[PDB]
Amino acid sequence: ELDIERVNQTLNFETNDCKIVGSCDIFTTSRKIFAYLIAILNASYPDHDFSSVEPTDFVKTSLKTFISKFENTLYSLGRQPEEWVWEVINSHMTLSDCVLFQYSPSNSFLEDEPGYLWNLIGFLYNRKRKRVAYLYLICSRL
Amino acid sequence: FLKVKGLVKQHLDSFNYFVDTDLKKIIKANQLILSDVDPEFYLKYVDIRV
Amino acid sequence: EEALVYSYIEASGREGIWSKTIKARTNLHQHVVLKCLKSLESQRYVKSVKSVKFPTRKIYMLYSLQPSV
């Protein structure tokens, strides 16, 4: 939509000698969910298989702890993070009563990408609406 | 001279040229939208008016 | 378009090819070559083997059955 386009215009930028490309998306298409996210990873990056690493590191952390450093890195990149974003992703998904996941293994699949610096990948599973957002931030260097 | 022209004609005639001639010569310079996935779903702009 | 990717497998010849190294010489449409290899998997020519090298990348090779260690 338009608001999703705005919050994606937020998360794609480049400062002096760094280039961050990430976005959020919401779409409806813990034993059964292990395959439900690797398809999102396959469609997100159609050059790496994600059926390989099945017992991965999904750090089932608090979403408040996640959005804390998700806001701290936007302070840390000179962005002054705009608060309405966190209502907009609420307004499509009912951010309060939902659980968060995070693909952060030992060695992620972007370490071989040249110019890689760091990532921040957020999964937000919903139960009543089945609306999983794939919030991802990839900081590169050019 | 100044009756039918005026003194702000260098602003007025240029903007009248843009909304009556140069809007067409921008639409015609890039008329068509080509979808790379399924190269049949095209999209072209016939004309423009404000 | 399906014949130049055959020679690029033959450019690899023995090990295989990764799908984003296709764009090093082709740089064609990223989705046309995305669905071409799915039908080429259905063509029963190529197969999706796994990397002897650094893993977690789509390695494709014709029916040679020839990996390394």
PDB file of all heavy atoms in Angstrom, chain A residues 2 15 33 37 40 61 64 67 71 87 93 112 126-127 129 131 133 135:
ATOM      1  N   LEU A   2       0.231   2.389   0.310  1.00  0.00           N
ATOM      2  CA  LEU A   2       0.967   3.647   0.344  1.00  0.00           C
ATOM      3  C   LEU A   2       1.788   3.761   1.618  1.00  0.00           C
ATOM      4  O   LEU A   2       2.941   4.194   1.576  1.00  0.00           O
ATOM      5  CB  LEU A   2      -0.001   4.824   0.206  1.00  0.00           C
ATOM      6  CG  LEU A   2       0.521   6.238  -0.063  1.00  0.00           C
ATOM      7  CD1 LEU A   2      -0.476   6.955  -0.938  1.00  0.00           C
ATOM      8  CD2 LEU A   2       0.724   7.034   1.212  1.00  0.00           C
ATOM      9  N   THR A  15      24.536   6.333   3.435  1.00  0.00           N
ATOM     10  CA  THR A  15      25.245   7.444   4.037  1.00  0.00           C
ATOM     11  C   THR A  15      26.648   7.458   3.421  1.00  0.00           C
ATOM     12  O   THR A  15      26.898   6.793   2.409  1.00  0.00           O
ATOM     13  CB  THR A  15      25.174   7.296   5.561  1.00  0.00           C
ATOM     14  OG1 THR A  15      23.868   6.819   5.904  1.00  0.00           O
ATOM     15  CG2 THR A  15      25.317   8.642   6.268  1.00  0.00           C
ATOM     16  N   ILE A  33       5.909 -24.368  11.828  1.00  0.00           N
ATOM     17  CA  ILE A  33       6.349 -23.082  11.299  1.00  0.00           C
ATOM     18  C   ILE A  33       7.799 -23.081  10.853  1.00  0.00           C
ATOM     19  O   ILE A  33       8.242 -22.099  10.248  1.00  0.00           O
ATOM     20  CB  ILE A  33       6.167 -21.965  12.340  1.00  0.00           C
ATOM     21  CG1 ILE A  33       7.004 -22.272  13.579  1.00  0.00           C
ATOM     22  CG2 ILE A  33       4.704 -21.814  12.699  1.00  0.00           C
ATOM     23  CD1 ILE A  33       7.073 -21.141  14.565  1.00  0.00           C
ATOM     24  N   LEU A  37       8.801 -20.497   7.361  1.00  0.00           N
ATOM     25  CA  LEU A  37       9.694 -19.351   7.262  1.00  0.00           C
ATOM     26  C   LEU A  37      10.822 -19.560   6.270  1.00  0.00           C
ATOM     27  O   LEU A  37      11.320 -18.584   5.695  1.00  0.00           O
ATOM     28  CB  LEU A  37      10.293 -19.027   8.632  1.00  0.00           C
ATOM     29  CG  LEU A  37       9.522 -18.136   9.610  1.00  0.00           C
ATOM     30  CD1 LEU A  37       8.271 -18.790  10.168  1.00  0.00           C
ATOM     31  CD2 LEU A  37      10.446 -17.747  10.746  1.00  0.00           C
ATOM     32  N   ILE A  40       9.808 -18.302   3.008  1.00  0.00           N
ATOM     33  CA  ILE A  40       9.956 -16.852   2.961  1.00  0.00           C
ATOM     34  C   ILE A  40      11.408 -16.488   2.703  1.00  0.00           C
ATOM     35  O   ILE A  40      11.709 -15.534   1.977  1.00  0.00           O
ATOM     36  CB  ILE A  40       9.442 -16.232   4.273  1.00  0.00           C
ATOM     37  CG1 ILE A  40       7.991 -16.639   4.512  1.00  0.00           C
ATOM     38  CG2 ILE A  40       9.548 -14.716   4.249  1.00  0.00           C
ATOM     39  CD1 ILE A  40       7.497 -16.305   5.894  1.00  0.00           C
ATOM     40  N   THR A  61      12.977 -14.126  21.058  1.00  0.00           N
ATOM     41  CA  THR A  61      13.150 -13.042  22.010  1.00  0.00           C
ATOM     42  C   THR A  61      11.906 -12.169  22.057  1.00  0.00           C
ATOM     43  O   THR A  61      10.984 -12.308  21.250  1.00  0.00           O
ATOM     44  CB  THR A  61      14.370 -12.194  21.642  1.00  0.00           C
ATOM     45  OG1 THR A  61      14.164 -11.598  20.356  1.00  0.00           O
ATOM     46  CG2 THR A  61      15.613 -13.059  21.597  1.00  0.00           C
ATOM     47  N   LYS A  64       9.651  -6.341  22.177  1.00  0.00           N
ATOM     48  CA  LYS A  64      10.028  -5.038  22.707  1.00  0.00           C
ATOM     49  C   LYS A  64      11.539  -4.895  22.749  1.00  0.00           C
ATOM     50  O   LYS A  64      12.074  -3.837  22.397  1.00  0.00           O
ATOM     51  CB  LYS A  64       9.427  -4.837  24.101  1.00  0.00           C
ATOM     52  CG  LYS A  64       7.963  -4.369  24.114  1.00  0.00           C
ATOM     53  CD  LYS A  64       6.958  -5.486  23.829  1.00  0.00           C
ATOM     54  CE  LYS A  64       5.533  -4.975  23.878  1.00  0.00           C
ATOM     55  NZ  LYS A  64       4.562  -6.015  23.452  1.00  0.00           N
ATOM     56  N   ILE A  67      12.518  -4.323  19.001  1.00  0.00           N
ATOM     57  CA  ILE A  67      12.286  -2.984  18.481  1.00  0.00           C
ATOM     58  C   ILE A  67      13.111  -1.952  19.222  1.00  0.00           C
ATOM     59  O   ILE A  67      13.345  -0.869  18.679  1.00  0.00           O
ATOM     60  CB  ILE A  67      10.798  -2.596  18.520  1.00  0.00           C
ATOM     61  CG1 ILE A  67      10.289  -2.536  19.956  1.00  0.00           C
ATOM     62  CG2 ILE A  67       9.975  -3.560  17.691  1.00  0.00           C
ATOM     63  CD1 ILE A  67       8.899  -1.970  20.084  1.00  0.00           C
ATOM     64  N   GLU A  71      15.271   0.396  16.966  1.00  0.00           N
ATOM     65  CA  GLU A  71      15.219   1.846  17.017  1.00  0.00           C
ATOM     66  C   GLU A  71      16.591   2.440  17.318  1.00  0.00           C
ATOM     67  O   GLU A  71      16.934   3.515  16.806  1.00  0.00           O
ATOM     68  CB  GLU A  71      14.180   2.250  18.057  1.00  0.00           C
ATOM     69  CG  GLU A  71      13.885   3.717  18.138  1.00  0.00           C
ATOM     70  CD  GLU A  71      12.728   4.019  19.064  1.00  0.00           C
ATOM     71  OE1 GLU A  71      12.137   3.063  19.603  1.00  0.00           O
ATOM     72  OE2 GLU A  71      12.416   5.207  19.262  1.00  0.00           O
ATOM     73  N   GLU A  87       3.317   2.403  14.404  1.00  0.00           N
ATOM     74  CA  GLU A  87       1.877   2.195  14.400  1.00  0.00           C
ATOM     75  C   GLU A  87       1.391   1.606  13.092  1.00  0.00           C
ATOM     76  O   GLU A  87       0.446   0.806  13.103  1.00  0.00           O
ATOM     77  CB  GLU A  87       1.124   3.495  14.690  1.00  0.00           C
ATOM     78  CG  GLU A  87       1.070   3.886  16.160  1.00  0.00           C
ATOM     79  CD  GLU A  87       2.261   4.690  16.611  1.00  0.00           C
ATOM     80  OE1 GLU A  87       3.105   5.016  15.764  1.00  0.00           O
ATOM     81  OE2 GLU A  87       2.354   5.003  17.813  1.00  0.00           O
ATOM     82  N   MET A  93      -1.266  -5.395  11.325  1.00  0.00           N
ATOM     83  CA  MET A  93      -0.816  -6.682  11.823  1.00  0.00           C
ATOM     84  C   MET A  93      -1.162  -6.937  13.287  1.00  0.00           C
ATOM     85  O   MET A  93      -1.076  -8.093  13.723  1.00  0.00           O
ATOM     86  CB  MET A  93       0.701  -6.793  11.577  1.00  0.00           C
ATOM     87  CG  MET A  93       1.402  -8.117  11.805  1.00  0.00           C
ATOM     88  SD  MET A  93       3.073  -7.953  11.188  1.00  0.00           S
ATOM     89  CE  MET A  93       3.677  -6.609  12.202  1.00  0.00           C
ATOM     90  N   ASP A 112      29.518 -14.344   2.755  1.00  0.00           N
ATOM     91  CA  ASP A 112      30.232 -14.526   1.505  1.00  0.00           C
ATOM     92  C   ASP A 112      29.892 -13.452   0.483  1.00  0.00           C
ATOM     93  O   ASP A 112      30.562 -13.369  -0.553  1.00  0.00           O
ATOM     94  CB  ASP A 112      29.920 -15.917   0.960  1.00  0.00           C
ATOM     95  CG  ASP A 112      30.495 -17.013   1.831  1.00  0.00           C
ATOM     96  OD1 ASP A 112      31.625 -16.847   2.337  1.00  0.00           O
ATOM     97  OD2 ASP A 112      29.795 -18.017   2.063  1.00  0.00           O
ATOM     98  N   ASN A 126       1.965 -13.913  13.188  1.00  0.00           N
ATOM     99  CA  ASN A 126       0.635 -13.633  13.693  1.00  0.00           C
ATOM    100  C   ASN A 126      -0.192 -14.907  13.618  1.00  0.00           C
ATOM    101  O   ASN A 126      -0.011 -15.736  12.722  1.00  0.00           O
ATOM    102  CB  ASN A 126      -0.037 -12.499  12.912  1.00  0.00           C
ATOM    103  CG  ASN A 126      -1.277 -11.950  13.606  1.00  0.00           C
ATOM    104  OD1 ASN A 126      -1.749 -12.494  14.607  1.00  0.00           O
ATOM    105  ND2 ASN A 126      -1.770 -10.825  13.112  1.00  0.00           N
ATOM    106  N   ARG A 127      -1.098 -15.054  14.579  1.00  0.00           N
ATOM    107  CA  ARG A 127      -1.931 -16.240  14.700  1.00  0.00           C
ATOM    108  C   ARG A 127      -3.339 -16.021  14.165  1.00  0.00           C
ATOM    109  O   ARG A 127      -3.832 -16.823  13.370  1.00  0.00           O
ATOM    110  CB  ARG A 127      -1.991 -16.675  16.166  1.00  0.00           C
ATOM    111  CG  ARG A 127      -2.876 -17.871  16.404  1.00  0.00           C
ATOM    112  CD  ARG A 127      -2.289 -19.107  15.758  1.00  0.00           C
ATOM    113  NE  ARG A 127      -3.144 -20.272  15.964  1.00  0.00           N
ATOM    114  CZ  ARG A 127      -3.068 -21.077  17.017  1.00  0.00           C
ATOM    115  NH1 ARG A 127      -2.176 -20.842  17.970  1.00  0.00           N
ATOM    116  NH2 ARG A 127      -3.886 -22.114  17.121  1.00  0.00           N
ATOM    117  N   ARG A 129      -4.427 -13.563  12.238  1.00  0.00           N
ATOM    118  CA  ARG A 129      -4.453 -13.003  10.897  1.00  0.00           C
ATOM    119  C   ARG A 129      -3.475 -13.682   9.957  1.00  0.00           C
ATOM    120  O   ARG A 129      -3.531 -13.423   8.749  1.00  0.00           O
ATOM    121  CB  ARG A 129      -4.149 -11.499  10.944  1.00  0.00           C
ATOM    122  CG  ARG A 129      -5.127 -10.689  11.784  1.00  0.00           C
ATOM    123  CD  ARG A 129      -4.697  -9.238  11.925  1.00  0.00           C
ATOM    124  NE  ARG A 129      -4.721  -8.520  10.654  1.00  0.00           N
ATOM    125  CZ  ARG A 129      -5.788  -7.891  10.169  1.00  0.00           C
ATOM    126  NH1 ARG A 129      -6.924  -7.889  10.848  1.00  0.00           N
ATOM    127  NH2 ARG A 129      -5.721  -7.261   9.004  1.00  0.00           N
ATOM    128  N   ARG A 131      -0.407 -13.127   9.502  1.00  0.00           N
ATOM    129  CA  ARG A 131       0.312 -12.070   8.804  1.00  0.00           C
ATOM    130  C   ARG A 131       1.735 -12.022   9.336  1.00  0.00           C
ATOM    131  O   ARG A 131       1.992 -11.490  10.419  1.00  0.00           O
ATOM    132  CB  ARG A 131      -0.403 -10.738   8.981  1.00  0.00           C
ATOM    133  CG  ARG A 131      -1.708 -10.654   8.225  1.00  0.00           C
ATOM    134  CD  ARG A 131      -2.333  -9.305   8.432  1.00  0.00           C
ATOM    135  NE  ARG A 131      -3.606  -9.154   7.739  1.00  0.00           N
ATOM    136  CZ  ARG A 131      -3.729  -8.665   6.510  1.00  0.00           C
ATOM    137  NH1 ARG A 131      -2.655  -8.279   5.838  1.00  0.00           N
ATOM    138  NH2 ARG A 131      -4.926  -8.556   5.954  1.00  0.00           N
ATOM    139  N   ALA A 133       5.347 -10.514   8.966  1.00  0.00           N
ATOM    140  CA  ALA A 133       6.181  -9.481   8.379  1.00  0.00           C
ATOM    141  C   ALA A 133       7.620  -9.953   8.337  1.00  0.00           C
ATOM    142  O   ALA A 133       8.108 -10.589   9.273  1.00  0.00           O
ATOM    143  CB  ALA A 133       6.090  -8.181   9.173  1.00  0.00           C
ATOM    144  N   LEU A 135      10.798  -8.214   8.299  1.00  0.00           N
ATOM    145  CA  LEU A 135      11.527  -6.970   8.481  1.00  0.00           C
ATOM    146  C   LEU A 135      13.016  -7.271   8.408  1.00  0.00           C
ATOM    147  O   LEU A 135      13.545  -7.996   9.253  1.00  0.00           O
ATOM    148  CB  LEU A 135      11.140  -6.340   9.821  1.00  0.00           C
ATOM    149  CG  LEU A 135      11.584  -4.935  10.230  1.00  0.00           C
ATOM    150  CD1 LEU A 135      12.952  -4.903  10.898  1.00  0.00           C
ATOM    151  CD2 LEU A 135      11.576  -4.039   9.014  1.00  0.00           C
TER     152      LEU A 135
END
